[PDB]
Design a protein around this ligand. Sequence first.
Ligand SMILES: NC(=O)c1cccnc1
Ligand SMILES: NC(=O)c1cccnc1
Ligand SMILES: NC(=O)c1cccnc1
Ligand SMILES: NC(=O)c1cccnc1
Ligand SMILES: NC(=O)c1cccnc1
Ligand SMILES: NC(=O)c1cccnc1
Ligand SMILES: [Cl-]
Ligand SMILES: [Cl-]
Lengths: 262, 262
Amino acid sequence: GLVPRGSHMRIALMQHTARPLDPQHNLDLIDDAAARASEQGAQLLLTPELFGFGYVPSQICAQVSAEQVDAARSRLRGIARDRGIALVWSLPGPEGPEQRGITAELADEHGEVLASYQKVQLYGPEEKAAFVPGEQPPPVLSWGGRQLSLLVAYDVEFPEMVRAAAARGAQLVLVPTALAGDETSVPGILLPARAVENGITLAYANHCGPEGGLVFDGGSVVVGPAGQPLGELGVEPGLLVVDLPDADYLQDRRAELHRNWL
Amino acid sequence: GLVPRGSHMRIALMQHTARPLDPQHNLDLIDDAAARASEQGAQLLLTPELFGFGYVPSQICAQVSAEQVDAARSRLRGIARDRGIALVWSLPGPEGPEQRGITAELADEHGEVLASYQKVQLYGPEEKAAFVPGEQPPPVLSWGGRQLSLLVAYDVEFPEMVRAAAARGAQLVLVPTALAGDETSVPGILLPARAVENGITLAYANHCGPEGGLVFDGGSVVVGPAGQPLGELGVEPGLLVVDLPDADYLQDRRAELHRNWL
Ligand SMILES: NC(=O)c1cccnc1
Ligand SMILES: NC(=O)c1cccnc1
Ligand SMILES: NC(=O)c1cccnc1
Ligand SMILES: NC(=O)c1cccnc1
Ligand SMILES: NC(=O)c1cccnc1
Ligand SMILES: NC(=O)c1cccnc1
Ligand SMILES: [Cl-]
Ligand SMILES: [Cl-]
């Protein structure tokens, strides 16, 4: 409804089904969602992991060129600008098929790429055959009056990855994902702890429905610092729109000891 | 009931109210619980943080001598032996009042002290005025056919502390605690994640009721590797007895990167 009294940030999450190896289709879906989110007063749209090509790691490595990635990237940049909304997307990285990772990028409403990140924690043998793991910590940046950060999918299941973002100042962690197999423990158990154990908000945007030989769970969610869902979807396509309201674990943690004990 | 087919470990958790600065009373309560647990076929009893003197940090530092600590320790050792049950207790450490931490120790049914641990993550200004933080990682040891470990209270709220135990091989993490203030997020949100994110079982033994100017929450619980409660108490004194049944986060985590990013 109307933009509320105590809130200066409204975010949207796109939950949908991608078609493998059909970027025109999947990017048309992103464009649709961007327009709709913008019309509802959202200032940012989060979209799912590898959405533009589908979550099909082995086929991305075999069939998707660098030039095809770049064409999808340019189109997404154009959607951010033309729909007048900040956009988080996830594509393969820009290098050749044998050198690139899974990435996420944040563009603002003018189309500026503010931040780029390469997934550090690859999931399973197919991802590890198709992609190179990232080696850099999550980025943290001011946008819309808060410190935003990016992580991808499996990354968020590691407390260390969320802690790395929060140690840099993150307040809002945005996570494209691709979770199938009725893995209710990730949104149900791990995400709430990630939020509480850092005092942060996390947004988690999944595929749903039949795609790439899997049936994705949906369950997209925004979790606030008390671990509660600010908004959530079920198993069907949807656009989740959430107004964010404006123990000291981060100070208390004995990081110099912890780093020796991992 | 009868010791079940698929289980070779039955554990007990004592949840009760301590009297500040009255070790005879509080250790009599531990003895009672040890006897009862042993009669029910439990092989180990976990008891709460600082139970023998009450959770009264400032008064422990002002009034409880080293010699008084040692007398309580010897009595607890005797309860393990005389009740024929392994026992986890938590007392101040053995040094002078200005040099000692909060500790936990595991004795076997013969009274052998198998392991000792000093709380690394002190909670709040009163603990930090009264006790020295520990500097050593959690111990991990074979007992009863599994790898057991110790952590104390606030420690378990840090993913790094549980990860440190699991990295050493822990399967069962035993946690004396003292949690008041209706802090439902610790057992409700953090403990289940600790268990899932390492694939371990955790046992969490709280005070309950009015003690030391607080009203403790109870909520003692054993959480298995899927994050579910194997057994749980409410707010009243009780003895929880649980039979333990017999993603690869621990291998997949990029620990050499994580250690640079905390
Ligand atoms: N954004 C607003 O102007 C507004 C007006 C009335 C009620 N809520 C919000
Ligand atoms: N995908 C990306 O992260 C990226 C970063 C810089 C340039 N092109 C792509
Ligand atoms: N896409 C992912 O990183 C993933 C898939 C399955 C489980 N957890 C994470
Ligand atoms: N421990 C046992 O002998 C037993 C016997 C029957 C049923 N369950 C356990
Ligand atoms: N409380 C303890 O940890 C301890 C260890 C060794 C000797 N005495 C006490
Ligand atoms: N006893 C503790 O370490 C403690 C107290 C309050 C909150 N969390 C932990
Ligand atoms: Cl919340
Ligand atoms: Cl479980």
